Scaffold this active site. Structure first.
Site, short mmCIF file in Angstrom:
data_model
loop_
_atom_site.label_atom_id
_atom_site.label_comp_id
_atom_site.label_asym_id
_atom_site.label_seq_id
_atom_site.Cartn_x
_atom_site.Cartn_y
_atom_site.Cartn_z
N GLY A 93 0.75 -1.25 0.00
CA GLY A 93 0.00 0.00 0.00
C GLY A 93 0.78 1.30 0.00
O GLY A 93 2.01 1.32 -0.12
N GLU A 94 0.03 2.41 0.15
CA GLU A 94 0.51 3.79 0.17
C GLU A 94 -0.22 4.57 1.28
O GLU A 94 -1.39 4.29 1.56
CB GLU A 94 0.22 4.42 -1.21
CG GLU A 94 0.69 5.86 -1.39
CD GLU A 94 0.35 6.46 -2.74
OE1 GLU A 94 -0.85 6.70 -3.00
OE2 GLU A 94 1.29 6.69 -3.54
N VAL A 95 0.49 5.52 1.92
CA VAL A 95 -0.04 6.40 2.95
C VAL A 95 -0.32 7.76 2.28
O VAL A 95 0.58 8.35 1.67
CB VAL A 95 0.87 6.53 4.20
CG1 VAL A 95 0.26 7.47 5.25
CG2 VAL A 95 1.16 5.17 4.83
N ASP B 228 11.15 -2.24 12.26
CA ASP B 228 11.61 -1.34 11.18
C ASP B 228 11.72 0.11 11.64
O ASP B 228 11.38 1.03 10.88
CB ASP B 228 10.74 -1.50 9.90
CG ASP B 228 11.37 -0.98 8.61
OD1 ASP B 228 12.61 -0.91 8.54
OD2 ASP B 228 10.62 -0.66 7.67
C1 LIG Z 1 6.72 3.55 4.46
C2 LIG Z 1 7.33 4.82 5.05
N1 LIG Z 1 6.26 5.73 5.76
C3 LIG Z 1 5.13 6.26 4.92
C4 LIG Z 1 4.44 7.42 5.62
N2 LIG Z 1 3.95 7.01 6.94
C5 LIG Z 1 3.02 7.86 7.61
C6 LIG Z 1 3.24 9.17 7.27
C7 LIG Z 1 2.52 10.21 7.93
C8 LIG Z 1 2.82 11.58 7.73
C9 LIG Z 1 2.18 12.52 8.53
N3 LIG Z 1 2.32 13.92 8.41
C10 LIG Z 1 3.00 14.63 7.48
O1 LIG Z 1 3.54 14.15 6.48
C11 LIG Z 1 3.05 16.12 7.78
C12 LIG Z 1 4.07 16.98 7.07
C13 LIG Z 1 2.62 17.23 6.80
C14 LIG Z 1 2.00 18.51 7.38
C15 LIG Z 1 0.49 18.41 7.29
O2 LIG Z 1 0.06 18.14 5.95
C16 LIG Z 1 0.55 16.87 5.52
C17 LIG Z 1 2.06 16.86 5.42
N4 LIG Z 1 1.28 12.19 9.49
C18 LIG Z 1 0.98 10.92 9.65
C19 LIG Z 1 1.56 9.85 8.91
C20 LIG Z 1 1.32 8.48 9.18
C21 LIG Z 1 2.05 7.52 8.55
CL1 LIG Z 1 1.78 5.85 8.96
C22 LIG Z 1 4.98 6.39 7.79
C23 LIG Z 1 5.66 5.24 7.06
C24 LIG Z 1 8.48 4.39 6.03
O3 LIG Z 1 9.61 4.14 5.20
C25 LIG Z 1 9.54 4.92 4.00
C26 LIG Z 1 8.18 5.60 4.03
O4 LIG Z 1 8.39 6.93 4.49
#
Ligand SMILES: C[C@@]1(N2CCN(c3cc4cc(NC(=O)[C@H]5CC56CCOCC6)ncc4cc3Cl)CC2)COC[C@@H]1O
EC number: 2.7.11.1
Length: 258
Positions: free
Chosen positions: A14-16, A117
């Site tokens: 998936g994608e977040v 991780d």
């Molecule tokens: C797979 C990986 N990742 C994907 C992104 N993910 C999440 C990213 C999130 C990101 C954020 N908030 C923001 O990005 C803030 C800056 C702003 C300000 C407000 O507007 C929107 C952007 N909040 C909650 C999140 C929840 C999750 Cl679960 C964590 C895991 C780990 O390895 C490589 C990838 O990075």
């Protein structure tokens, strides 16, 4: 009801994405996964979580083969984006983030969950700069009914993985998460990762085992946090420092300001 505004990041399954409510304008993080036994496991672990240093899970909605996972949107973004390449960050900010990381990891280990991780990409920050452990897609149970289960699965991110994961058929969960926290600490204090992987074929790792701390990233790190890193980044997991002893470390307990 929602609408995919921006991509926040992509994982294995998936994608977040940033989802803004079509009625309320409420902005949240949604993990959109296509297609099974792993999403059932991930949902189960996400419902167990309740701590100040762990992302808040709202709920889940299913649409055929598509799975939606609703999570807390962290306004401060990621720890990755706070690390200045080749520099790191001010030592008091790194200490505070490390204290919060330890608090979140103690909590997870306390409920018998291993993250598997830990890295700056999944350590997010709220409006008050509080660290939150996110991304439970690789998380698993290592303790149940007060009985420890050894891990055997290969997973994580090579620069962050503990060396026993590449050598041993089975290994203890907790020292693996301690090790990744050590690499995160190095990243916060040097703005650089120490090696591509903790293997004898990797020169930088051999250099560390040979105590060549006059080399980067180590030469950028002050003696006190470096003494802690010498206790964390120990090859033999049975000789590696535990979180109860990290809490007794000189740098961990050093008063720092600004
Ligand atoms: C797979 C990986 N990742 C994907 C992104 N993910 C999440 C990213 C999130 C990101 C954020 N908030 C923001 O990005 C803030 C800056 C702003 C300000 C407000 O507007 C929107 C952007 N909040 C909650 C999140 C929840 C999750 Cl679960 C964590 C895991 C780990 O390895 C490589 C990838 O990075």
């Amino acid at each position: 009801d929602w609408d995919l505004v921006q991509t926040l990041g992509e994982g294995a399954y998936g994608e977040v994405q940033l989802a803004v409510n079509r009625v309320t304008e409420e902005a949240v993080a949604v993990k959109i996964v296509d297609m099974p036994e792993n999403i059932k496991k991930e949902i189960c672990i996400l419902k167990m979580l309740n701590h100040e240093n762990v992302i808040k899970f709202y709920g889940h909605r299913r649409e055929g083969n598509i799975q939606y996972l609703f999570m807390e949107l962290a306004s401060g973004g990621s720890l990755f984006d706070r690390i200045e390449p080749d520099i790191g960050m001010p030592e008091p900010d790194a200490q505070r983030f490390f204290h919060q990381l330890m608090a979140g990891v103690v909590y997870l280990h306390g409920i018998g969950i291993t993250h598997r991780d830990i890295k700056p990409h999944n350590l997010l920050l709220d409006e008050r700069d509080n660290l939150k452990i996110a991304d439970y897609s690789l998380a698993t149970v290592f303790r149940y009914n007060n009985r420890e289960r050894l891990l055997n699965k290969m997973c994580g991110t090579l620069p962050y993985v503990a060396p026993e994961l590449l050598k041993r058929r089975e290994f203890h969960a907790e020292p693996v998460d301690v090790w990744s926290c050590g690499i995160v600490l190095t990243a916060m204090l040097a703005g650089e990762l120490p090696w591509d992987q903790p293997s004898d074929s990797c020169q930088e790792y051999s250099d560390w085992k040979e105590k060549k701390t006059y080399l980067n990233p180590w030469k950028k790190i002050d003696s006190a946090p470096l003494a802690l890193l010498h206790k964390i980044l120990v090859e033999n997991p049975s000789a590696r420092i535990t979180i109860p002893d990290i809490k007794k470390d000189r740098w961990y307990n050093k008063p720092l300001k600004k």
